[PDB]
């Protein structure tokens, strides 16, 4: 039967497409279908995804609409892309990762058409600067459980590396469906292309800024430096006149110059040094 070592491989474009589509329609549950292939019965590759038109005034859309799907499938082939659909996906904004009651019936159709599909759930607003929340599930039947047998026969220990969250356990999960591991395929070309973000032209690194605002900024900084200097010794003197057990709590409402002056020093040194060096080499690069 099925095993716990099943793997799914998601490209970068598919991830970014589905993330953007899910983030666009935040208040409701948008949906779409994937496409890829089954190279074997341990790993399933998905290579491209596409969104589908929805019926508004709700948070759920039935997937049965053959005209659009058929047209997209027969039109993508004209420019490559001979792949077939492998499953569907939809987004849960700020909830987690699970399958609602109607979702079992929704995925039942794909199971009937092909017994080895998969459902992907992405969380668009709980992910920040990494750790994108994406899960993949497949359904099970209760008659086989009546036989006193459990699905997903285990042959190795690489299938139990992540413990499920408590909210997944609260809903159906293991008594109604099983999750599978996920992986991202990375190659050198797209990764090398993608690191060009926020790179600046060669012009931005040779401008030496105006020589009028710089002195104003230095003058502004020096005065607060002076005031913090005046306030330092007051806190230095009374550092031990009070028991140290409440020393930390004494600094809960008012600022302390010691921490609040180092940032001034750092920014000031950095600005002055870089402004000097830029003009230093520019005096000889040009004539």
């Amino acid at each position: 039967a099925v095993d716990t070592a099943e793997q799914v491989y998601i490209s970068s474009l598919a991830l970014l497409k589905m993330l953007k589509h899910g983030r666009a329609g935040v208040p409701m549950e948008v949906m779409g279908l994937m496409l890829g292939e089954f190279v074997d019965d341990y790993t399933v590759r998905v290579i491209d995804v596409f969104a589908m038109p929805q019926s508004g005034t709700g948070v759920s859309v039935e997937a049965v609409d053959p005209v659009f799907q058929a047209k997209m499938l027969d039109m993508l082939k004209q420019t490559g892309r001979p792949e077939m659909v492998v499953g569907w996906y939809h987004s849960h904004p700020g909830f987690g990762c699970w399958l609602s009651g109607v979702d079992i019936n929704t995925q039942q159709s794909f199971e009937a058409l092909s017994e080895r599909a998969v459902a992907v759930v992405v969380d668009p607003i709980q992910s920040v600067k990494g750790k994108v929340v994406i899960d993949a599930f497949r359904l099970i039947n209760a008659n086989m459980m009546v036989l006193g047998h459990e699905p997903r026969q285990t042959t190795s220990n690489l299938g139990h590396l992540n413990k499920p969250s408590i909210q997944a356990l609260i809903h159906g999960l293991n008594r109604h469906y099983y999750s599978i591991t996920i992986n991202y395929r990375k190659n050198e070309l797209e990764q090398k292309m993608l690191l060009n973000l926020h790179k600046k032209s060669w012009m931005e690194g040779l401008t030496l800024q105006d020589y009028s605002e710089h002195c104003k900024h230095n003058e502004s900084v020096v005065k607060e430096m002076l005031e913090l200097a005046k306030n330092y010794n007051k806190a230095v003197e009374e550092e031990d006149k009070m028991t140290p057990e409440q020393l930390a709590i004494k600094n809960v409402g008012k600022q302390d110059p010691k921490r609040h002056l180092e940032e001034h020093v750092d920014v000031l040194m950095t600005s002055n040094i870089v402004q000097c060096l830029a003009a230093m080499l520019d005096t000889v690069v040009f004539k």
Binding site: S12, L15, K20, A51, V132, G205, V222, L268, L281
Partner: protein, 286 residues
């Protein structure tokens, strides 16, 4: 007309995988697609794009084939999922602009009177941006033609949206800047500037070498701009400039002096605090 164009990484990834999937089949050289985006003031934004069947012959640069119905129905189909997007222009992955670009631009200027051409390099080898942006215009001069169609460059840059930003941050696990400070302020700005300036001077060297020995189509606007460049170099031997330079440098160093003094004082205070607090810990063990 147009001041700046902003390009999201999504269209870059789409260009890359379209090129891969269509070049795997056979030995094609150039591929074409159409972009979607938005306008605001004089700033253009590009969001996504889709491909289109295109054919071109290497025998002659006057024969080529595009599909109209494909473009029309595909735009109509993307309309039903998001109505904010609209046709803005097209892209071709050629390493350098070709002769047929004017003809294709005229062909698909029907769908957008302000079409903008974008060139994306699929295998860059330098630190420069992979994208270049052009717009058509009519130029006039003394003799030859009252008007002639000519491309003009427009500033381009790579932008990012929140979801796109978190996606690309998740994808770039291996490479990340070491420090943020004088390091990133120096190497990412100055050395790269020297690199780019040297590359530009080398290219103009090459063009000037091509003249007065080889082909020799003497062009005069380039000469005028070269004279303007060579006339604008300042003089650094003037006495007043030297005096002002010295005055400003001497004015600037005092601040670094003061900051170093403050850092030394803070370090001494920290040392005193640690020593005093830690010397009172050995006797508690008995």
């Amino acid at each position: 007309a147009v001041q700046k164009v902003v390009v999201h990484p999504l269209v870059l990834l789409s260009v890359v995988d379209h090129f891969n999937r269509i070049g795997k089949v056979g030995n094609q050289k150039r591929v074409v697609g159409v972009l979607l985006g938005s306008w605001q003031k004089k700033v253009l934004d590009v969001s996504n794009s889709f491909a289109v069947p295109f054919d071109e012959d290497d025998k002659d640069d006057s024969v080529w084939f595009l599909d109209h119905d494909y473009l029309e129905n595909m735009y109509g189909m993307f309309k039903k999922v998001n109505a904010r997007e609209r046709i803005v222009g097209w892209y071709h992955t050629g390493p350098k602009l070709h002769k047929n670009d004017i003809a294709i631009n005229e062909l698909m200027k029907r769908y957008c009177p302000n079409s903008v051409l974008v060139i994306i390099d699929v295998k860059p080898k330098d630190l420069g941006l992979p994208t270049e942006a052009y717009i058509s215009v009519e130029e006039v001069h003394d003799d030859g033609t009252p008007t002639s169609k000519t491309f003009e460059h427009v500033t381009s840059e790579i932008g990012a949206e929140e979801a796109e930003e978190v996606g690309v941050e998740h994808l770039l696990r291996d490479i990340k800047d070491t420090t943020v400070g004088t390091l990133s302020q120096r190497i990412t700005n100055q050395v790269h500037g020297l690199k780019g300036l040297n590359s530009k001077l080398l290219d103009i060297r090459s063009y000037l070498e091509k003249v007065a020995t080889g082909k020799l189509p003497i062009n005069h606007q380039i000469i005028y701009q070269l004279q303007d460049v060579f006339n604008l170099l300042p003089d650094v031997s003037l006495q007043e400039f030297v005096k002002a330079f010295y005055l400003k440098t001497n004015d600037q160093m005092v601040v670094v002096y003061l900051a170093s003094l403050i850092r030394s004082v803070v370090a001494l205070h920290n040392l005193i605090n640690n020593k005093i607090a830690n010397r009172d810990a050995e006797k508690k063990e008995g």
